[PDB]
Design a protein around this ligand. Structure first.
Ligand SMILES: [Cl-]
Ligand SMILES: [Cl-]
Ligand SMILES: [Cl-]
Ligand SMILES: [Cl-]
Ligand SMILES: [Mg+2]
Ligand SMILES: [Mg+2]
Ligand SMILES: [Mg+2]
Length: 263
């Protein structure tokens, strides 16, 4: 909607950075709205949904078990690891790690999951296999969050990741049980959801994953809609801003508020 595009432009002006935006119809994949849809942005922590997709593909294939216990050590622990820092001595199962990575934004959990699949290159190969030609993961947390100028590492485009999320959450890439488990993780309540959840109306469905990195990187991918059922995918990315985190959050949240208002 033009009203949403105005809010995307206002965000670029206020934040002093590029903003990328896409909305897709969930059922058809038709592009409803877009702004800088094929420009590159850091994935930031939005990659964690793609990662758990890859894990679930391996579960479907009999190559991984959700109940497999992963044991790890103190120097696997990186910053922003609220769940994994509670399990150094007992380990965590693969399903516990995906829940932690997606719902609690746990960096160590995502790194351990990356190990389970064989690393960033294997995630990139899985993406290529399912038809995503743009998205790339090169590094693990927190390195992938650096957001360096002119660096193509750990980037996607809004259009590419929107299409990939649609492939994972709908149709036949994952089994129904896997599809439902990924949605469950993404729908689970989080500690704070400033970008879309905070103002989302009661009774709306939302399955989302946000990310924040260095150098102004911020992103969210989501499936959402009224009446407890998703009907659109929205992706919003920015990088480069040196505005405060609160200002960055507020400008992105206004884009979401407009999407909902003019739905
Ligand atoms: Cl454009
Ligand atoms: Cl573009
Ligand atoms: Cl492993
Ligand atoms: Cl959020
Ligand atoms: Mg050990
Ligand atoms: Mg649930
Ligand atoms: Mg809820």
């Amino acid at each position: 909607h033009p009203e949403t595009l105005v809010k995307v432009k206002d965000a670029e002006d206020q934040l002093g950075a590029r903003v990328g935006y896409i909305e897709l119809d969930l059922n058809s994949g038709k592009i409803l709205e877009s702004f800088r849809p094929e420009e590159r942005f850091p994935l930031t922590s939005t990659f964690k949904v793609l990662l758990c997709g890859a894990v679930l593909s391996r579960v479907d294939a009999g190559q991984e078990q959700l109940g497999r216990r992963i044991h790890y050590s103190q120097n696997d622990l990186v910053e922003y690891s609220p769940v994994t820092e509670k399990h150094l001595t007992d380990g965590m199962t693969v399903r516990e790690l995906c829940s932690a990575a997606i719902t609690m934004s746990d960096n160590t959990a995502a790194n351990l999951l990356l190990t389970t699949i064989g690393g960033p290159k294997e995630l990139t190969d899985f993406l290529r296999q399912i038809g995503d030609k743009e998205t790339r993961l090169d590094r693990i947390e927190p390195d992938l969050n650096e957001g360096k100028l002119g660096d193509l590492r750990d980037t996607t485009t809004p259009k590419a990741i929107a299409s990939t999320l649609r492939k994972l959450l709908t149709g036949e890439l994952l089994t129904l049980a896997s599809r439902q488990q990924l949605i469950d993780w993404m729908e689970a309540d989080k500690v704070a959801g400033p970008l879309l959840r905070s103002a989302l109306p009661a009774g709306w469905f939302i399955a989302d994953k946000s990310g924040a990195g260095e150098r102004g990187s911020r992103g969210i991918i989501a499936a959402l809609g009224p009446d407890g059922k998703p009907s659109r995918i929205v992706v919003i990315y920015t990088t480069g801003s040196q505005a405060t985190m609160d200002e960055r959050n507020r400008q992105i949240a206004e884009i979401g508020a407009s999407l909902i208002k003019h739905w």
